[PDB]
Design a binder for this molecule. Structure first.
Ligand SMILES: Nc1nc2c(ncn2[C@@H]2O[C@H](COP(=O)(O)OP(=O)(O)NP(=O)(O)O)[C@@H](O)[C@H]2O)c(=O)[nH]1
Ligand SMILES: [Mg+2]
Lengths: 166, 82
């Protein structure tokens, strides 16, 4: 049985812990509880393949910075998360991307870009803006809603389908 | 000051404590989805025995007070050594 390591990375409050818990415990966390570090793992069958994915939920607060290296080393795939009503979280995806390919020392690491909270009316970041960025990185982009559960599976599954092809 | 608890098989959760064992265990059990800090006890895999910590780590195992033997993935998670 295959074991895929996934690391969820992004600015604070963008919806990493919420997206994760929705895939696993299947239900929307309505509260904000600053994550330090939590790891989940579930029995899943993706494309007929039965795998056990180990998901590392990162801290978005810069106050829990340091930890970044250690966990970015031992992780196969990375899904970068930004909230569509948080312009800074978008602009922040760039520095995350670099820190990933910097510690890994590789110009190509499995990586999906997620646009979360797309269930909200507020929207300071257009989908093209993301499309353009994901494109120049050579990676896929998915818009999700931990609340409405939109694209949540699409995001994580595409990330494993990504690791395999690489 | 910032503890890492192992439980529900592989799963781990991190929390910040100020010394109060009971309060911290409570928060920890919340992060794992388990009720009441009486049903549980903390144990740390040490060399060749599941020692039960009385009063204080990158590894602490929440295990049921009744039958305190951590799962194989729980014990396996302790592979993390520095
Ligand atoms: N409308 C809406 N709110 C969301 C969504 N996902 C997250 N939230 C809300 O935003 C808050 C923070 O989300 P959370 O997942 O905890 O963010 P995080 O990225 O894990 N933050 P941290 O890095 O500190 O752990 C929570 O109250 C949660 O309910 C979403 O898809 N839609
Ligand atoms: Mg988080």
């Amino acid at each position: 049985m295959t074991e895929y390591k996934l690391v969820v990375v992004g600015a604070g409050g963008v919806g990493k812990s919420a997206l994760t818990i929705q895939l696993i415990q299947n239900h929307f966390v309505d509260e904000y509880d600053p994550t330090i570090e939590d790891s989940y793992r579930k029995q899943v069958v993706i494309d007929g393949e039965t795998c056990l994915l180990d998901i590392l939920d990162t801290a978005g607060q810069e106050e829990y910075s340091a930890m970044r290296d250690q966990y970015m080393r031992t992780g196969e795939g990375f899904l970068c998360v930004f909230a569509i009503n948080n312009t800074k979280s978008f602009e922040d995806i760039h520095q995350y991307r670099e820190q990933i390919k910097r510690v890994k020392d590789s110009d190509d690491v499995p990586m999906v870009l997620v646009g979360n909270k797309c269930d909200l009316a507020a929207r300071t970041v257009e989908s093209r803006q993301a499309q353009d960025l994901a494109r120049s990185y050579g990676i896929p982009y998915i818009e999700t809603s931990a609340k409405t559960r939109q694209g949540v599976e699409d995001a994580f599954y595409t990330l494993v389908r990504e690791i395999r092809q690489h | 000051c910032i503890l890492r608890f192992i439980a529900c098989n592989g799963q781990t959760r991190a929390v910040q404590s100020r010394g109060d064992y009971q309060k911290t265990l409570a928060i920890a059990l919340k992060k794992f989805s388990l009720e009441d800090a009486s049903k549980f006890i903390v144990c740390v895999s040490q060399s060749s025995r599941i020692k039960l910590i009385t009063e204080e780590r990158d590894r602490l195992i929440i295990v049921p007070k009744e039958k305190p033997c951590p799962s194989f993935e729980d014990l396996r998670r302790s592979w993390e050594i520095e």
